[PDB]
Write an enzyme that holds these catalytic residues in place. Sequence first.
Site, PDB file in Angstrom:
ATOM      1  N   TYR A  99       0.827  -1.178   0.000  1.00  0.00           N
ATOM      2  CA  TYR A  99       0.000   0.000   0.000  1.00  0.00           C
ATOM      3  C   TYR A  99       0.880   1.253   0.000  1.00  0.00           C
ATOM      4  O   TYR A  99       2.040   1.218   0.433  1.00  0.00           O
ATOM      5  CB  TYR A  99      -0.936   0.059   1.201  1.00  0.00           C
ATOM      6  CG  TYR A  99      -0.307   0.343   2.539  1.00  0.00           C
ATOM      7  CD1 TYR A  99       0.216  -0.672   3.308  1.00  0.00           C
ATOM      8  CD2 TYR A  99      -0.147   1.645   3.003  1.00  0.00           C
ATOM      9  CE1 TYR A  99       0.848  -0.429   4.500  1.00  0.00           C
ATOM     10  CE2 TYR A  99       0.469   1.903   4.229  1.00  0.00           C
ATOM     11  CZ  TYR A  99       0.985   0.866   4.975  1.00  0.00           C
ATOM     12  OH  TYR A  99       1.605   1.125   6.172  1.00  0.00           O
ATOM     13  N   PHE A 118       2.602  10.909   4.428  1.00  0.00           N
ATOM     14  CA  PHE A 118       2.652   9.722   3.592  1.00  0.00           C
ATOM     15  C   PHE A 118       3.143   8.511   4.381  1.00  0.00           C
ATOM     16  O   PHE A 118       3.835   8.691   5.393  1.00  0.00           O
ATOM     17  CB  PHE A 118       3.699   9.932   2.498  1.00  0.00           C
ATOM     18  CG  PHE A 118       3.319  11.133   1.652  1.00  0.00           C
ATOM     19  CD1 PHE A 118       3.589  12.435   2.081  1.00  0.00           C
ATOM     20  CD2 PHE A 118       2.656  10.939   0.417  1.00  0.00           C
ATOM     21  CE1 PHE A 118       3.253  13.534   1.302  1.00  0.00           C
ATOM     22  CE2 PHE A 118       2.317  12.053  -0.363  1.00  0.00           C
ATOM     23  CZ  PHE A 118       2.579  13.349   0.109  1.00  0.00           C
ATOM     24  N   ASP A 119       2.827   7.302   3.891  1.00  0.00           N
ATOM     25  CA  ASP A 119       3.292   6.064   4.502  1.00  0.00           C
ATOM     26  C   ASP A 119       3.155   4.952   3.478  1.00  0.00           C
ATOM     27  O   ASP A 119       2.137   4.865   2.792  1.00  0.00           O
ATOM     28  CB  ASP A 119       2.425   5.660   5.689  1.00  0.00           C
ATOM     29  CG  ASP A 119       2.711   4.316   6.321  1.00  0.00           C
ATOM     30  OD1 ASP A 119       3.933   4.116   6.669  1.00  0.00           O
ATOM     31  OD2 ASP A 119       1.722   3.584   6.560  1.00  0.00           O
ATOM     32  N   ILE A 143      -7.920  -0.014  10.383  1.00  0.00           N
ATOM     33  CA  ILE A 143      -9.100   0.827  10.385  1.00  0.00           C
ATOM     34  C   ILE A 143     -10.268   0.145   9.656  1.00  0.00           C
ATOM     35  O   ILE A 143     -10.051  -0.696   8.751  1.00  0.00           O
ATOM     36  CB  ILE A 143      -8.841   2.209   9.761  1.00  0.00           C
ATOM     37  CG1 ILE A 143      -8.239   2.138   8.335  1.00  0.00           C
ATOM     38  CG2 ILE A 143      -7.923   3.083  10.662  1.00  0.00           C
ATOM     39  CD1 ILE A 143      -8.209   3.494   7.671  1.00  0.00           C
ATOM     40  N   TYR A 151      -9.870   7.325  11.832  1.00  0.00           N
ATOM     41  CA  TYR A 151      -9.480   7.629  13.192  1.00  0.00           C
ATOM     42  C   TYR A 151     -10.413   8.615  13.916  1.00  0.00           C
ATOM     43  O   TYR A 151     -10.120   9.041  15.006  1.00  0.00           O
ATOM     44  CB  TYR A 151      -8.030   8.099  13.238  1.00  0.00           C
ATOM     45  CG  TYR A 151      -7.074   7.061  12.709  1.00  0.00           C
ATOM     46  CD1 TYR A 151      -6.604   6.059  13.525  1.00  0.00           C
ATOM     47  CD2 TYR A 151      -6.700   6.991  11.392  1.00  0.00           C
ATOM     48  CE1 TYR A 151      -5.724   5.101  13.075  1.00  0.00           C
ATOM     49  CE2 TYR A 151      -5.832   6.042  10.909  1.00  0.00           C
ATOM     50  CZ  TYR A 151      -5.323   5.090  11.763  1.00  0.00           C
ATOM     51  OH  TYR A 151      -4.484   4.116  11.284  1.00  0.00           O
ATOM     52  N   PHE A 170      -5.653   5.852   0.198  1.00  0.00           N
ATOM     53  CA  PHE A 170      -4.728   4.758  -0.006  1.00  0.00           C
ATOM     54  C   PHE A 170      -4.841   4.239  -1.424  1.00  0.00           C
ATOM     55  O   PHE A 170      -5.923   4.131  -1.995  1.00  0.00           O
ATOM     56  CB  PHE A 170      -5.012   3.546   0.900  1.00  0.00           C
ATOM     57  CG  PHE A 170      -4.858   3.775   2.404  1.00  0.00           C
ATOM     58  CD1 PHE A 170      -5.875   4.346   3.165  1.00  0.00           C
ATOM     59  CD2 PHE A 170      -3.672   3.428   3.057  1.00  0.00           C
ATOM     60  CE1 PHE A 170      -5.725   4.571   4.530  1.00  0.00           C
ATOM     61  CE2 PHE A 170      -3.518   3.662   4.414  1.00  0.00           C
ATOM     62  CZ  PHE A 170      -4.537   4.181   5.139  1.00  0.00           C
TER      63      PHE A 170
END
Length: 128
Positions: free
Chosen positions: A45, A55-56, A75, A101, A118
């Site tokens: 992802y 970002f991640d 989530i 969240y 995402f």
Amino acid sequence: GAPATVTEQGEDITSKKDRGVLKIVKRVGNGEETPMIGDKVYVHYKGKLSNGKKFDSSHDRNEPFVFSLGKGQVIKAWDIGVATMKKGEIAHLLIKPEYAYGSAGSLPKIPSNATLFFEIELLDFKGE
Ligand SMILES: COc1cc2cc(c1OC)OC[C@@H](C)OC/C=C/[C@H](O)[C@@H](C)OC(=O)[C@@H]1CCCCN1C(=O)[C@H]2C1CCCCC1
């Protein structure tokens, strides 16, 4: 960009039809099976706050991200969204805070009332 394309063109995959999880299939996957609660799921992802301010990516860790669907490890939007995906599919999800969240947030990474984007590639999934 991609967040605004999902706003405009995404399918609402929520049961309540509240546009809380919007989806575009960017690359079609294969097979009839989709992930189900309890399955072990393997993805790559790329995520970010929808305004680009963080970002991640699983690639940051040089390995697929693995989780059990519906086990409270991700989530709610991922439990809902990944359950619609086929093996090999790439999808885009745009996510309202109620399916992420919420008003509490998750500092320092996630502010209150954050919308999330995402890109997810579903690599594989296995029964428990
Ligand atoms: C709120 O904290 C984080 C959020 C996110 C990533 C985080 C977080 O720090 C624990 O670290 C990356 C690694 C360490 O963890 C991966 C999965 C974590 C868990 O599965 C939870 C916390 O994450 C999620 O449920 C979702 C979906 C799975 C992938 C990670 N995602 C996130 O919300 C990201 C988030 C995406 C937008 C930009 C900031 C990071």
